[PDB]
Design a protein around this ligand. Structure first.
Ligand SMILES: [Mg+2]
Ligand SMILES: [Mg+2]
Ligand SMILES: [Mg+2]
Ligand SMILES: [Mg+2]
Ligand SMILES: [Mg+2]
Ligand SMILES: [Mg+2]
Ligand SMILES: [Mg+2]
Ligand SMILES: [Mg+2]
Lengths: 194, 95, 108, 58, 132, 90, 47
RNA sequence: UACACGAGUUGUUCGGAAACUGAGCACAACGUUAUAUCGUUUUGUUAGGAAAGUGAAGGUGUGGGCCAUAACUGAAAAGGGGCAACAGAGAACCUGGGUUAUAUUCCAAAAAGAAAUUGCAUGUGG
RNA sequence: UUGCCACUCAGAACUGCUUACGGCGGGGAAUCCAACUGUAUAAUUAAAACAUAGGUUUGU
RNA sequence: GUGGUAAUGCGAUUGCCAGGUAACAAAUCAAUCCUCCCACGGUGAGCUUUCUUUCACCAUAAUCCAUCUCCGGCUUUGCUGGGGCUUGGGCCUUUUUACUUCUCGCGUUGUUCGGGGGCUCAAGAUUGAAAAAUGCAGCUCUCGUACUGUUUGUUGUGAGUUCUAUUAAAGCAAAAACCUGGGG
């Protein structure tokens, strides 16, 4: 249920004598036996997790984390990544550009892998059949197939009903609209083909 | 049954009107190749014991077992006889 | 006279666990379970998952009682590691301490 | 069941304390010595007149 | 030049697979019983365990022994190193022959040396354990 | 020379339209294609799972690329790393 | 059941097979060690 | 296959449990609720102090220690228990035969035999 | 170098049905609709409906 | 604990860590197994105006022991080692393949390994024990009574073994117990 490869990375447990085992999303290029470094003074090879305010600027970082410690949230689906834009050493916060254009500011002590998440280019191979969409979501959750609400009865959906399959009222619904009504284009601020 | 089994090993087998399934279903196509290719390899490993050079007169021809150019075990042995001679004739005319 | 047979035990299902058909000295042809022949002792899955030589594929009962030398060679890391994955582990355990104590100590 | 490949070790393990019975056997082409210990039966099959010898006493 | 006698190696690929062992007699080519390079060598099957510094007693003897083997190991089963022991390739390197009835007493002298040469401070490395 | 125009996609025949078959053919021909491993040297990478490439001859698993080995923006990323390591050190 | 036999009928018991009949009543078969004849107990116990 | 009476189901090893985990369940705690029979609950619980598995000095027959059981302490050790699979995992037995009806279940001592196996024991091997 | 352990096909004449278990596509030309396999009104509706891949949009 | 250059052989134990087994979808393909057939040879009953031989039976369980000798040496008194069964593997040692060679499988591939010996591995056969007094059964005679036979070879199909291809934006459970090792 994920296009990105998960790399099983083992570290040593700093305190006990074990070898703690860590499951991480794999930056593209990272292979079995690469000796990954994830600390403060870590080098910046393609896969290391050196801190975000210590990575050079204009660099390419995946698996960045918003809060300092949440263990990686952002830029973590396949092929996705963030570009570091600006450091503000007076504030101590880095402004990285999320893989949606929406560029935000995070603290300069967050951690971040170096590279692109594996499995890039998944979304470009077309499915060609309903059966290859069956097996995609059977590892993911249970939302397939999508019955159009306009093909439903006017008891089960706000669009359903009529002698023709038409949305009776404008599809763009309010941001404030109650759930069960907030269906269609939610708070659509720009509508339709550009 | 053994009256037919006696009369169906030497001759009087099925005919154009006794067949009911395709020839690739009666006598498979994938196993008349298989056997006929085991034989062209069971014969070339026989001929690395003491037969011809077996480096470039075996594997020049090991891929001709699987290239459908020999259509029988016999059909193979004249082709190595056509080449073994000038493999010892070019080794004869040499001055 | 072609007898058919039964699942003698109480499990009458054809799971990969049962897999039972032998003739009997009383000619009462009847079928018996097999053992599920386990894959043998292997190297770690990470390190090129391969069967170890000098080791048997004994089941939980054969393994729990047979001798210890039926499941391990007399090397170091025998029965967990193959000679390939020992000999490479001894030079890497030594070529590293060599490149260390010369390069961790070059500061007079 | 084990088959004693010995005349010394057999006469040792055959003269042990378990000795549930010693069933003298006559079969074609051999003569077989079934000692019944508590957990095995140890056989000593032989092709010689030594059968009738170690039959009287053993 | 590389495999001189008295030079310590690591016995790779054998029963003693990670042990440190010193070459005492190398060879080049034998006829039928050693087509391989034939460096006979004595080495450690029993490392002297760490001196506890606690109950200094006969237990320090029972835990500072050096058990010794002698094998003519092929050269592709060693790993030569930088070190030496200087264990008399010309004095001891000949009274340790390998023929039958010798591996009984010849083995107990290169053992009889490692007895004292560890009890004395000579190498302090050859008698550690190659941790792998 | 079987199947003169649409190749690997002969599995489908008339179905799925020409261009979806052709857009998916470019990506179906590469995931089955063996790639080169700067490790062993010889072409050995197969695609044991999406974004996962294994080299039997090399016995090591590189990660990355859904239908190729290295997405051609990792090709730029992989350099910018050392670009921003070496020149950013020396 | 073995202990009880020996405590009630001073005979040895080797194999005591039991079964809860389709009456809720537990039957018991009892081998008498081949040294206490069973036909000499049913005649004693009065079976 | 009705009615009546009488009988009939035999296991160290077969199935199940004792003894695995799965989807999942939810006792405790905790929270919430007028109220709970509510919710959280193994990809590890709980504002959260959740446990004898071991090692020991000392106690004890007796020529003060030879030797030995035992008490009662208490050595580190994070992540409370617990269910849920008669098709997953696991699981030490095979033939021969003498019931009106049971048998891998029964057979008694020329066990009709032959095995495997668990527990505790005495003892030959170091 | 001709010894022993193979029923498959090919051809020949020979004869005789132009009469022969069982099992076993009618085909072609078009128009319309849906692209397709798929699902679906258990007990009157299997469709041209749903799904679908694809396309786009919106929110984040 | 001790042997073999080495694959790895052999001998009689209590807590951490690391592995391993459990533990894996379906495919295609080659021997055991069993089913069936055929050629066998042997037994019983069937057909017979005829014509001929049709059909039945011929069995080997779990668990074990060791590869008999080819050979040292054809058994002196018997060593140097009691190794071997083969075909699929994985390796080991020793000598090589560069003029593109080569090794492959029915098959999508292996080398940058090619032969000679060895080390194991799991199928699997084999002798031996179980094991013939069993069992099937006919019999000469009269549940008694005895003994005469206690036979393997071929094919074909199959279930597992074999090789952790192919659909994969599908990559095709987990755990105990158990096992081995490092430290002990
Ligand atoms: Mg409404
Ligand atoms: Mg509305
Ligand atoms: Mg396995
Ligand atoms: Mg009734
Ligand atoms: Mg509750
Ligand atoms: Mg596995
Ligand atoms: Mg065949
Ligand atoms: Mg586990």
């Amino acid at each position: 249920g994920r296009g990105a490869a998960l790399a099983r990375v083992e570290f040593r447990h700093p305190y006990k004598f074990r070898r703690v085992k860590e499951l991480m999303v794999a930056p593209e290029g990272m292979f079995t036996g690469q000796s990954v470094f994830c600390g403060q003074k870590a080098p910046l090879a393609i896969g290391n997790v050196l801190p975000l305010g210590q990575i050079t600027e204009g660099c390419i970082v995946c698996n960045v984390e918003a809060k300092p410690g949440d263990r990686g949230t952002l830029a973590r689906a396949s092929g996705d990544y963030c570009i570091i834009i600006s450091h503000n050493h007076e504030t101590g916060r880095t402004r990285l550009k999320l893989p949606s254009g929406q560029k935000k500011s995070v603290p300069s002590t967050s951690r971040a892998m170096i590279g692109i998440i594996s499995g890039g280019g998944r979304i470009e191979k077309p499915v060609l059949k309903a059966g290859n969409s069956f097996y995609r979501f059977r590892g993911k959750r249970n939302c397939w197939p999508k019955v159009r609400g306009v093909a439903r009865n006017p008891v089960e959906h706000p669009h359903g009903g009529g002698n023709h399959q038409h949305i009776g009222h404008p599809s763009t619904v309010s941001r404030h609209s109650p759930p069960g009504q907030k269906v269609g284009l939610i708070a659509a601020r720009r509508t339709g083909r550009i | 049954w053994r009256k037919m089994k006696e009369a169906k090993d030497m001759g009087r087998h099925n005919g154009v009107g006794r067949r009911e399934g395709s020839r690739e279903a009666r006598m498979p196509s994938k196993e008349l190749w298989m056997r006929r290719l085991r034989i062209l390899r069971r014969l070339l490993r026989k001929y690395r014991a003491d037969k011809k050079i077996d480096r470039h007169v075996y594997r020049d021809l090991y891929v001709r077992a699987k290239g459908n150019v020999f259509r029988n075990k016999r059909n193979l042995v004249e082709h190595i006889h056509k080449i073994k001679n000038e493999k010892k004739k070019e080794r004869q005319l040499a001055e | 006279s072609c007898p058919r047979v039964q699942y003698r035990r109480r499990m009458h299902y054809a799971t990969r666990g049962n897999r039972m058909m032998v003739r009997t000295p009383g000619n009462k042809l009847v079928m018996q379970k097999r053992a599920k022949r386990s894959q043998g002792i292997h190297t770690p899955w990470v390190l090129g998952h391969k069967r170890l030589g000098g080791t048997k594929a004994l089941r939980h009962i054969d393994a729990r009682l047979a001798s210890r030398h039926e499941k391990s060679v007399s090397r170091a890391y025998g029965g967990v590691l193959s000679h390939d994955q020992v000999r490479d582990r001894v030079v890497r355990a030594f070529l590293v301490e060599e490149q260390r104590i010369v390069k961790q100590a070059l500061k007079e | 069941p084990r088959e004693i490949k010995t005349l010394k070790e057999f006469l040792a393990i055959c003269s042990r304390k378990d000795a549930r019975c010693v069933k003298v056997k006559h079969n074609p082409s051999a003569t077989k010595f079934k000692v019944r210990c508590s957990r095995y039966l140890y056989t000593l099959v032989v092709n010689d007149k030594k059968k009738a010898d170690k039959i009287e006493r053993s | 030049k590389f495999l001189k006698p008295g030079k310590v190696v690591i016995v790779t690929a054998g029963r003693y697979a990670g042990h440190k062992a010193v070459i005492v007699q190398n060879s080049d080519i034998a006829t039928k019983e050693r087509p391989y390079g034939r460096a006979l060598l004595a080495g450690i099957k029993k490392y002297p365990k760490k001196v506890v510094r606690g109950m200094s007693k006969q237990t320090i003897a029972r835990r500072s022994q050096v058990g010794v083997f002698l094998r003519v190991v092929n050269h592709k089963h060693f790993l030569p190193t930088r070190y030496n022991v200087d264990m008399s390739k010309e004095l001891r390197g000949k009274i340790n022959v390998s023929d039958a009835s010798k591996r009984s007493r010849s083995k107990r002298l290169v053992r009889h040396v490692f007895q004292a040469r560890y009890n004395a401070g000579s190498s302090m490395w050859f008698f550690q354990r190659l941790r792998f | 020379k079987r199947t003169v125009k649409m190749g690997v996609m002969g599995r489908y025949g008339t179905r799925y339209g020409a261009n979806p078959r052709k857009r998916a053919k470019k990506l179906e021909v590469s995931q089955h294609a063996k790639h080169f491993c700067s490790f062993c040297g010889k072409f050995a990478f197969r695609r044991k799972a999406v974004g996962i490439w294994r080299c039997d001859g090399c016995s090591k698993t590189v990660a990355g690329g859904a239908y190729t080995l290295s997405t051609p923006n990792n090709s730029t990323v992989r350099s910018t790393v050392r670009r921003l390591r070496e020149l950013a050190k020396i | 059941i073995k202990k009880a036999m020996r405590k009630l009928y001073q005979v040895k018991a080797v194999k005591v097979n039991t079964l809860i009949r389709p009456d809720g009543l537990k039957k018991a078969y009892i081998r008498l060690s081949a040294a206490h004849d069973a036909l000499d107990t049913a005649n004693k116990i009065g079976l």
